[PDB]
Each structure stands twice: as C-alpha cells, then as structure tokens.
Amino acid sequence: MTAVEFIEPLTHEEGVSQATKLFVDTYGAAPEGVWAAPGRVNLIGEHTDYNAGLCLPIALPHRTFIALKPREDTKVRVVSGVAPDKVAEADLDGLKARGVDGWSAYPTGVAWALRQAGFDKVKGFDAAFVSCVPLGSGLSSSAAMTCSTALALDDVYGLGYGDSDAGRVTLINAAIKSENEMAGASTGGLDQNASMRCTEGHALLLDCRPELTPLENVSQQEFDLDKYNLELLVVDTQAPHQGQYAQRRATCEEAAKILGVANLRVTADGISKADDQFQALKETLDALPDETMKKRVRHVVTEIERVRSFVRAFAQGDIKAAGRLFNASHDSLAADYEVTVPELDIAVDVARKNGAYGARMTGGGFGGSIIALVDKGQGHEIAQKIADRFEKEGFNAPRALPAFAAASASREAK
Ligand SMILES: Nc1ncnc2c1ncn2[C@@H]1O[C@H](COP(=O)(O)OP(=O)(O)O)[C@@H](O)[C@H]1O
Ligand SMILES: [Cl-]
Ligand SMILES: [Cl-]
Ligand SMILES: [Mg+2]
C-alpha cells in the first residue's frame, strides 16, 4: 500500500509559471496577466447561506490560476491543465442561459453575467487555467474558477470593482450567476464570498441576510492555528461523486412559507432571543406539517446558533468547546439534514477516536471532504488512520490537504 497522499498548494511562482506556459502553448500570444482565487473550507455554518444564516469559511492556500487576455471580439476560448489539448470555444453575442456545454460554462458565464449586469465594455477573452484545488471534492473548485475569472475580467476591462471588499460583491454576484444560470448548478454564495473576501489568518463570519451592505455582512475573525498549537486536518474522502440539494432548499423555502417568514434566519433569531429556547423551537416545529421538514428546520436553527458559539469559543481559546461545536454541526448534518454518507461519517469517527478536538464534513455533503481540529503535528497520523480504515472498508483511498486561513483572490502577475 502507499502512504496517504497530501496535495501541496502551488506557490505563487509555480501557479504563475504554469498558467502562463499553458496560455502561450495554447494561444501563442502572452497573457495580459495571471490572477488566482482559492478553494475554501467552511469551518461551521452549513446549509445556512441560502437560509440567510451565518457561515464561517476560510480560504485554502490551494488556488486556481487564470492567465487571461481580453479580445476585441465576443469569442471566449478557455483551456485547463486537466485536459490541456482540449480548447473550449463559445461566443458571448446572443448567448443565453445554459447556452454553454461543460466546464467552460463556469468562465464563459462570468463574462455573460457581467454583460447582463450592463457592463457593455466586457467583450471576449482567451484564458488558460492551472489549479491545485481538486475538482468535485467539496473544496469549491467551482468558485475558484468563477472568482479568478471575475477578478481577471474586472481588471483587464477596468470595471473598478476588484480593488475593494465592497466592490468585490459585484464580482461575486457575477460568479454566482455564472454557476446558477450558465452552468446550471445551484450555489448559495458561501463559496464565492470565501474565495474573494477571506483574509490570511482569519475566518470570514458571513451574515447571509440579503438586505445587508458589504461592510455590514462580514467580520474577520482571528483564526491563528499556531497561537493554540493546532492543525486543521482536511481529508478529501474521494467517495464516489453524486436533486437532493434542490429538495433541501425546497423544504427550507416551504418551512419559511408555512411559518410566514421571509427566511429561516428570522425563525432562528426569534428562537435564539427567547429565554426558553427549547420551548421556542418546539412551538416552531409544531407548526410544521411533517417530521422531515421539522428535522431540516431544527438543523438550520441550531446551526446558526452554533456559528456564534464557535466564534466565541475560538476567541476564548476554548478549543475543546470549539471542537464540540464542530462535532454537533456534523451530527446535525448526519441525523437532521441527512446529507452525510458512510465515508464522511467513518472519517469523522476515526478523527474523533484518535484525539481530534472535533471533526465534521464540510461543504454541501453527499461526499467530499471532512475537517478536524487536531494538535499540531497529528494531522498526518490521523489522515493515515483514516486511509487504513478506508482500505479495511473497501473505500477509495482518501487524500489530505494542508490547510490554514489563507489570502483571497488576487492578481498574481501583469
Ligand atoms: N481546474 C479546472 N479545470 C476545468 N474545469 C474545472 C476546474 N475546476 C473546476 N472545474 C469545473 O467545475 C466542476 C467542479 O465544480 P463542483 O461540481 O461545483 O465541485 P467543487 O466545487 O466541490 O470542486 C468541474 O466538474 C468542472 O466542470
Ligand atoms: Cl455583442
Ligand atoms: Cl428535504
Ligand atoms: Mg462547487
């Protein structure tokens, strides 16, 4: 057997060099520059973004690097190191929603979304992508691709949104619109906010209430693992990839209609404020027509409050309490939200039995990755324990990634 694999992040120099070479090898011309956007892990606050709740992601050091040059025509050519001989070409002139096939829908839909927003200066482009964000592993390769493309287009077309946090929200909404309306993948905004608004050494406490301005809806929460002698273990289970996500949103929207609220954040805040939170929840669930919907509402309400509990626990250096909150977030996703699979649940169980302060699935679920707060120096040991258990179970070998709170998207070269 081979020891469990760790996926190292591309350095600045590596990502620039590789993206530039693929661009020149593909297109002949030099790119105007290279931009990049990171993947992410959500620390806690899962299935809450589309309920107007609270989330707490970090940006991974793993980035997608885009080499880009604008075109004077409306042609879009993209290529990726995943399949470097296969250039995808589309045209923006008259392009409609779902008018692009395959991965190229993600970058092309970002230029489409900016033109739909009235950015008529945005024409076509050539791009080459090189990434170390694994595809389809619940680490947000999709946002790293759409956000890197949005920051690059904003830069070359001089739209003036990329150089401020608030201005990045315009680029975020174009990234979300690309993925929702061009690629046809429902996204709630956690991942794109992480990729373009996280900061090094911090977690992004994101308030997803849709009426808030950009300066109102984020606060940078110190997330210095070294201060507490900790490591954040991230393990991509590599469980075989899997409209269950549609059904979860639909159930939450129906719950909010029955309650007479705009969103379950309203519900959760009313329960949170009660002296008797147990009775406030019971009265809410009593209003709901069926046992499954009650489970879904119980998850979103308890999970929004766990985000505030986590932010408090971590600031107090109470790592045991922070871990317990990871644990409770996982258990809620497994039992009440029903979005776990055996690989996630067994990886988490191995982490918990091997000294993790806590461990949980991250992202949407149904596969993908787990995270665990562990003592510094224990991440390899716990990863290898998960890989040894995975082989005993007949599962695909997992892989791990080093993780700490890294920088958001940026221009890498010009
Ligand atoms: N480097 C890349 N090159 C080409 N396509 C990519 C790349 N990264 C992401 N994609 C596209 O995005 C999809 C992965 O996004 P998604 O299914 O949302 O998973 P995740 O966001 O968890 O990584 C891929 O199937 C492909 O269509
Ligand atoms: Cl046009
Ligand atoms: Cl459901
Ligand atoms: Mg995705």
User: How is 173-191 classified by DSSP, letter by letter?
Assistant: HHHHHIIIIII-----SHH
User: What are the CA-CA distances from residue 45 to residues 132, 312, 328, 375 (Å)?
Assistant: 25, 14, 11, 23
CB-based contact 124:149 (threshold 8 Å):
no
Return the DSSP state at 29. S
Annotated binding site for Mg(2+): 142, 179
Q: Which residues of 32-51 are buried (b: 16+ CB within 10 A; e: fewer)?
A: bbbbbbbbbbbbbbbbbbbb
Beta bridge partners of 375: 230
For 40-97, the DSSP string reads EEE-S-TT-GGGT-EE-EEEEEEEEEEEEEE-SSSEEEEEETTSTT--EEEE-TT--T
Q: After which residues is the chain broken (C to N over 2.5 A)?
A: 242
Residue 74 phi/psi, 5-degree rounding, is: -100, 15
Distance CA 140, CA 73 (A): 31
Sheet of 399-401, strands arranged across: 5-6, 399-401, 230-236, 369-375, 358-361
Residue with CA nearest ligand 1 atom 15:
142
Q: Which residues are catalytic?
A: 191
- Ligand with smallest separation from the Cα of 91: 2
Q: How many A from CA of 287 to the centre of ligand 4? A: 34
Is residue 315 within 6 Å of ligand 1 at its C-beta?
no
Tokens of 179: 């993925």
Tokens of 13: 């120099």
| Other CB atoms within 10 Å distance of the CB of residue 369 | 26
Q: How many A from CA of 296 to the centre of ligand 3? A: 7
Q: How many A from CA of 60 to the centre of ligand 4? A: 14
Distance CA 69, CA 6 (A): 33
| Ligand 1 atom nearest 64 alpha carbon | 1
Distance CA 223, CA 194 (A): 14
**Cα angle at 45 between 380 and 171, to 5 degrees?**
95
| Ligand 1 atom nearest 102 alpha carbon | 27
Residue 359 phi/psi, 5-degree rounding, is: -155, 150
Which domains can be identified in the chain, with CATH numbers? 1-222+405-414 (no CATH), 223-404 (3.30.70.890)
Distance CA 67, CA 34 (A): 4
Return the DSSP state at 241. P
| Ligand 1 atom nearest 105 alpha carbon | 27
Distance CA 125, CA 25 (A): 16
Resolution value, angstrom units? 1.5
Q: At what angle do helices 291-315 and 244-259 cross, to 10 degrees?
A: 90
